[PDB]
From a paper:
Streptomyces antibiotic regulatory proteins (SARPs) are widely distributed activators of antibiotic biosynthesis. Streptomyces coelicolor AfsR is an SARP regulator with an additional nucleotide-binding oligomerization domain (NOD) and a tetratricopeptide repeat (TPR) domain. AfsR null mutants show defects in afsS transcription, as well as production deficiencies in actinorhodin and undecylprodigiosin. It is presumed that upon binding of AfsR to a 22-base pair (bp) binding box (afs box), RNA polymerase (RNAP) holoenzyme is recruited to the afsS promoter, allowing for transcriptional initiation. We find AfsR uses its SARP domain to engage the afs box and make extensive interactions with all RNAP subunits except ω subunit.
Numbering used by the authors:
A (entry chain C): 727 to 871
B (entry chain D): 437 to 485
C (entry chain D): 50 to 97
D (entry chain I), J (entry chain J): 17 to 270
E (entry chain C): 1017 to 1129
F (entry chain G): 19 to 62
G (entry chain K): 239 to 311
H (entry chain F): 424 to 510
């Protein structure tokens, strides 16, 4: 019942985030995520979207959203470290939509709603993205039958 | 046995996370606490050992 | 001014941003520079 | 000169910061004024608050009544620049209305992205021309003579980014077959940069494919001696691996 | 095949989001919340007579704004667990009783607090 | 918080019309205000 | 003296402080430690290309300063 | 709530505090001293090149050059893995 | 056994190939019953190309030298007039599941 | 002499550093300010700050009056040169208003680029003439009487560049069949520079091409024994390939 694909099911989960216009500035859906390695953002699109059919696991970057800025109070230790490595001029914050813990799936669809286009959006937000991840769950221990 | 219970890998890894970080630092599989946390979140095989 | 600073070691008028000179009364607004958790313990009152 | 559009306003940050209106230079002003202009520019027209601008220009110890100093710096910018190019939003300033190619940093970013795309596409001449255009942007050290911890951070970041640009450029030069100029300029750079290991590995692979061996291993021995004297550790294993594969006279590189 | 799938039931937490009105952890699987140690559980631990495990499950593993950080530091650095403090919910109870015009004051052996 | 020196403090004495006397801690570099709100009754 | 022998086997070739010729000749063959050169016999380093008798004499004096000797010597 | 201090963040900050002093002690005493007098650290306010040239008594160019040398030494990848992941 | 495939115009096993009545997951199910023998220890790429209406089966596949299919009657999919199927099935050797 | 424009200011750094106006040299003066002028000239118009100038010129330990000494050297050059050539920007000193082809290094680089383009286009004689004109601009030793460590680094860089230009001109001359002067030049430089192995490889190619064989093998044996005595590697695969092609009497090389 595992090898012959008898008791298995496709489970599709939708998960969304929206880039809004807060008081400090507009949230941006961008690829240039700060303080992260290049291999993490390898599967993102030019505008910061995970590609269709890209296998994704827990903790991975789905859509790259950065907050515009935050009250900055760098500690002298972090200031000295910043001098050695250098940091982004923007000083944006990592609030991108990640995969929840213990989730594995294949991205089967992304829906983007833009305020600049004809799409209608709730007040405040500038754009919105929804990602569907689909996993073919086989039968395992603890599954109730 | 009567005194045993079977915890899953992910659940036991999440419960014992700081102990796993300390042991990873002690067994020099991670340079520091941040690297140990990154290895625990990534879920490598040495973390499970 | 009554319930303590909502920030950490800051005050209302924007002056006294650092941590070094903690525990002082700002002359502009009266906000004592201290931790934000003081707002969990500091109360006021209403005169009827 | 082919992109000199009428009414186009050009800004220079990759070297000494400057303003150019249709070809004529503008008096930027005091070094702190120049650093404020650079801080407002590098955010790609994002609104920076006055307190954050103070933190970028001066750091941890500002004088008490010197918010009006930033106010008069912004007023002097609006004197020098257009009334509408610098806008005031939420108590801060933002340099808006900038077209494409106006900022040299954005031009360098686009040129580097195009070079990477042509590397992915395998085009050597096009990416070589793109990097030649990129290297003709900055003049001298970046952010010359400006104070501030933000200015220092941008200086060191852009210097490191220029270092990786030179590394990729000259790795491509060794890929295409430019021996002489690469050997000469990397000798100059490693004379300027004594402890940069990547440039010294580039010297090793360049001299291994250029017919010169004695000064290569002399530089390598000096590298190990200086790295042991100044740090007390061992160099990176890739350098030792490439030196070992050089020692066995592998014809793959030749 | 029922929809009580094991991939959705399983949830674990060592340290995650904490609630705001009281500083205990919040609840739920999606928000990385902790299991509830209700009143009957506390009765069971008193019936064992394990004062220390009950105290650390009530004061260390929740409801202490400074105990949790110190215990995490002690586990990471390998040293022994620090002594538990005072739960935050008791302080919130004292503050809410004080604003109902009740002069609820703690007393030590020598004097007040 | 380990090794930090507080800005020098002076306790300035304020007295209201109703007789309430209280001390407020200010910095040495700070400008002392002649007017304050009374902690006891809220008066001048 | 066992710790001293371990230290004399453990240090890299760069502390041996001889000329670049014999150093390059031994590093080409893959020898990077003093103990690796000690474990080799005499015919092992007289089979090295471009390794003259002056190189052997210089190496022998070098290890003679350190107090140890070759294999089968 | 966002004002709640994350235990992992505080542990990382304390480990950064312990590691930065160790990597400063890895360097020479004079270089570590001028770095700690130049970029915050021991003393909250960071004293400028001019403000330290009286207690130590050299030129602006010498102190600037040794500061640049310390920055280049700390930028070397050997003393980087102990602090790169600390951000 | 077949261990991986690649359908042209398909990025994941939850789409539908334009012009076949069976979705890609049903294609996975039909491929999983295809019994093969591979002499090569390394994986081998077999090719299945079909244009136009008809019934694509295991007899329509192209087995390389050393790799042989053994049930050519196994139906794989159906194609209408605008159907076009191109798969590159990777076959490997092993034991068990 | 055909490009001697009236009022044109030219500079020479390929040999002794000098300034010429209408064919008449200018009083450069002290070697220290000569080194400063060379440091400003060698950046190809890129701005240089005063501090980096001090670090390049005086090395690691400047005396207590470095900034004022650099300022008075710049002032002396301001009287010596045109006021509009030497400018002060962002606390640094730069050389502007430089005409095309006035600088010997820039002219040599342009001639080298034109020669490379002609070689890619097949025009060997035009490329040879252009780079011969470029090589005629070197006035003996590079940076004569120019102190400072940066002066040594620039001397090494320009000497390596000149040696590589001579090397490529030599191979072009061997391909053109003009081996008579090439043999003498190669022997003179190998006497001057035994360390270069590519130059000795081109010398061996000339020896095989011109028609004598045994003394060419003597030259190869000399290179092999020098390599064994000084450094000790086996001959490189390119050199061994050339040697075995020469021993097999390859008609393609002849
Ligand atoms: Zn205030």
């Amino acid at each position: 019942l595992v090898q012959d694909d008898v008791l298995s099911s496709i489970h599709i989960e939708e998960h969304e985030v929206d880039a809004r216009d807060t008081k400090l500035g507009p949230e941006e859906i961008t690829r240039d995520i700060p303080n992260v390695s290049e291999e993490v953002l390898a599967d993102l699109d030019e505008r910061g979207i995970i590609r269709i059919g890209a296998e994704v696991v827990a903790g991975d970057i789905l859509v790259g959203k950065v907050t515009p800025k935050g009250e900055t109070e760098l500690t002298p230790e972090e200031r000295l470290l910043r001098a050695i490595f250098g940091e982004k001029a923007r000083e944006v914050r990592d609030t991108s939509l990640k995969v929840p813990h213990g989730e594995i799936g294949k991205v089967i669809g992304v829906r983007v709603f833009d305020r600049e286009e004809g799409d209608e959006l709730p007040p405040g937000v500038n754009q919105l993205v929804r990602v569907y991840v689909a996993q073919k769950r086989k039968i395992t221990d603890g599954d109730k039958l | 046995k009567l005194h045993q219970c079977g915890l899953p890998k992910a659940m036991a890894l999440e419960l014992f996370k700081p102990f796993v970080m300390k042991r990873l630092v002690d067994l020099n599989h991670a340079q520091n606490i941040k690297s140990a946390k990154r290895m625990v979140e990534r879920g490598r095989t040495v973390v499970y050992d | 001014k009554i319930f303590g600073p909502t920030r950490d070691w800051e005050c209302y008028c924007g002056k006294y941003k650092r941590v070094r000179f903690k525990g002082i009364i700002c002359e502009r607004c009266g906000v004592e520079v201290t931790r934000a958790k003081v707002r969990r313990e500091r109360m006021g009152h209403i005169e009827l | 000169a082919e992109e000199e559009e009428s009414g186009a306003l050009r800004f220079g940050v990759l070297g000494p910061v400057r303003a150019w209106r249709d070809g004529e230079t503008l008096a930027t002003g005091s070094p702190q004024q120049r650093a404020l202009l650079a801080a407002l520019l590098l955010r790609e027209g994002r609104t920076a608050t006055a307190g954050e601008l103070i933190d970028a220009l001066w750091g941890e110890e500002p004088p008490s009544q010197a918010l009006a100093a930033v106010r008069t710096y912004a007023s002097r910018l609006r004197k020098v620049l257009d009334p509408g190019v610098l806008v005031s939003e939420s108590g801060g300033y933002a340099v808006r209305g900038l077209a494409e190619g106006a900022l040299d940093l954005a031009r360098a970013q686009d040129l580097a992205s195009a070079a990477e795309k042509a590397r992915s596409a395998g085009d050597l001449c096009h990416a070589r021309d793109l990097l030649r255009r990129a290297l003709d942007l900055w003049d001298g050290e970046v952010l010359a003579g400006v104070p501030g911890p933000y200015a220092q951070t941008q200086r060191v970041r852009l210097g490191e980014w220029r270092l990786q640009l030179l590394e990729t450029r000259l790795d491509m030069d060794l890929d295409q077959g430019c021996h002489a100029e690469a050997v000469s300029e990397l000798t100059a750079l490693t004379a300027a940069h004594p402890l940069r290991e990547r440039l010294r590995e580039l010297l090793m692979l360049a001299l291994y494919r250029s017919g010169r061996q004695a000064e290569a291993l002399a530089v390598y021995a000096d590298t190990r001696r200086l790295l042991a004297d100044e740090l007390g550790v061992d160099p990176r294993p890739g350098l030792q691996e490439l030196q070992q594969r050089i020692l066995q006279a592998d014809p793959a590189l030749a | 095949k029922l929809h009580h799938l094991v991939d959705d039931k399983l949830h674990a937490r060592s340290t995650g989001p904490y609630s705001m009105i009281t500083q205990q952890p919040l609840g739920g699987k999606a928000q990385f919340g902790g299991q509830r140690f209700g009143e009957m559980e506390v009765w069971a631990l008193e019936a064992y007579g394990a004062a220390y495990a009950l105290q650390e499950l009530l004061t260390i593993k929740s409801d202490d704004v400074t105990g949790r950080v110190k215990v995490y530091e002690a586990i990471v650095k390998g040293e022994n667990i620090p002594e538990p403090g005072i739960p935050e919910s008791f302080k919130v109870l004292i503050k809410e009783m004080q604003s109902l015009c009740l002069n609820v004051e703690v007393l030590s052996s020598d004097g007040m607090s | 918080d380990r090794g930090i020196d507080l800005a020098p403090r002076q306790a300035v004495e304020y007295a209201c019309e109703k007789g309430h006397r209280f001390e407020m801690p200010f910095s040495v570099e700070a400008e002392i205000p002649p007017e304050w709100e009374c902690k006891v009754c809220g008066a001048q | 003296t066992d710790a001293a022998l371990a230290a004399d086997l453990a240090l890299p070739i760069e502390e041996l402080e001889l000329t670049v010729r014999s150093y390059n000749c031994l590093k080409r063959e893959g020898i990077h430690s003093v103990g690796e050169l000690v474990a080799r016999s005499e015919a092992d380093l007289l089979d090295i290309r471009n390794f003259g008798a002056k190189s052997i004499d210089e190496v022998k004096a070098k290890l003679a300063g350190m107090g140890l000797a070759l294999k089968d010597s | 709530d966002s004002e709640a201090v994350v235990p992992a963040d505080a542990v990382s900050f304390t480990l950064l505090q312990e590691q930065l002093h160790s990597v400063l002690d890895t360097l020479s005493e004079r270089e570590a001293g001028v770095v700690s007098m130049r970029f915050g650290l021991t003393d909250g306010q960071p004293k400028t090149l001019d403000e330290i040239g009286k207690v130590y008594g050299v030129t602006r160019e010498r102190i600037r050059q040794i500061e640049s040398k310390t920055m280049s030494k700390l930028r070397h990848p050997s003393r980087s893995q102990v602090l790169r992941d600390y951000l | 056994a077949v261990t991986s495939i690649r359908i042209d115009g398909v990025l994941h096993e939850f789409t539908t190939v334009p012009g076949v009545k069976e979705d890609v997951t049903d294609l996975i199910l039909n491929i999983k019953q295809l019994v093969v023998s591979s002499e090569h220890d390394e994986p081998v790429v077999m090719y299945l190309r079909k244009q136009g209406p008809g019934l694509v089966t295991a007899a329509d596949i192209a087995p390389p030298a050393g790799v042989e299919v053994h049930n050519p009657d196994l139906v794989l999919a159906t194609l209408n007039g605008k159907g076009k199927l191109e798969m590159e099935l990777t076959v490997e050797r092993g034991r068990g599941y």
